[PDB]
Symmetry: C3
Subunit: 150 residues, 3 copies
């Protein structure tokens, strides 16, 4: 199926984008490098699950993401508005976020057709929420102000 190549090619692109963001993270010594690396491991499992009726993808990583999301959102100021995508790390993570959401769209037809576990798409969903939150968090910890267009 060409849909499988498109899906696994885009989770590959996502993992590679995160690889580059990871390099900028470790340069400025932020602690959450290891979280990004762990996500790369799970994205490898996602690639295995996409190319195989379907391979079960356990909900463990989703619940771990949700835990990290709560950890960071509870540290951030309230936000009820879109932001402009706040530093090199943060902007790189926003690009990873958009690539993640494109990866999620490529997985939808495989879930619809029943060929992959719906947890794959759930994980990519929450991953894009995590990247959004982590970018805000990196921007805050760098002292960069959130820019909101009106």
């Amino acid at each position: 199926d060409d849909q499988v190549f498109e899906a696994v090619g885009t989770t590959d692109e996502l993992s590679s984008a995160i690889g580059f963001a990871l390099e900028l993270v470790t340069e400025k010594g932020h602690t959450f490098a290891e979280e990004l690396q762990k996500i790369q491991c799970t994205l490898q499992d996602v690639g295995s699950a996409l190319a195989t009726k379907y391979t079960t993808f356990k909900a463990g990583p989703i619940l771990e993401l949700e835990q990290w999301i709560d950890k960071y959102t509870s540290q951030l100021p309230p936000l009820t508005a879109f932001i402009l995508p706040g530093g090199k790390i943060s902007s790189a993570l926003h690009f990873c976020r958009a690539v993640c959401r494109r990866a999620k769209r490529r997985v939808v037809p495989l879930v619809q057709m029943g060929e992959t576990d719906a947890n794959v798409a759930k994980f990519l969903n929450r991953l894009s929420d995590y990247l959004f939150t982590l970018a805000r968090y990196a921007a805050m910890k760098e002292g960069n102000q959130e820019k909101i267009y009106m």
Copy 2:
């Protein structure tokens, strides 16, 4: 519609790519950071216009882009040949340019189907002309020579 998610997801990806290029710009103190940021604001308006028979997208930003395009092209040497994509900022802008053109392709079916203002697609068109010109301009102002393959 999946076409709407694809279109707004790619203008999101474009804005995020520009966010990263913006970080490299402001590091080397180039003046046109604020232009890139303003484009991010308009891309937010484009996302609103894409997700809504259709929402009117005013031609103001298009005419402002055309003004900036003329300002920079009038400073550049003549060019009648393709260039190889000239410095970190310039190459980042060339990547933003290609992402912009992909965003334009995702908007075409929505314009064809009458679901979004054709000015959306016109804006993305001229935005890719602007990014091409701005990259040449950044490369020139850095003293990097335009590389032309024969």
Copy 3:
């Protein structure tokens, strides 16, 4: 054809991604900058071949890539496992690799329909093998250890 715009737009995106990786390469003075630049030239020829029953694309660049691939793989430790995408240059090249594979997927329908030379798709195939190998090579020459998830 919209398929032609999608294909040439993605080889454009690939060349631009490589342009940025090239900037990181030349900063750290790695020797293989000129190889990346030569690939940009061939990608220009690929764009010409895609937009034109079809234009012959000579197999010269494919054989040159294969020569470079052998040169680098013969310097690398054995690998029988996926790696996590090893330094700024290496991670940038992994992102170029994933973009390259997306470009290859966009060329397939044009080759299938007989509209472009099948050598175009062969070149993009081997280009993604080359970028994978070059990224491993840059990571090795930087002393960064290959990270393998189990």
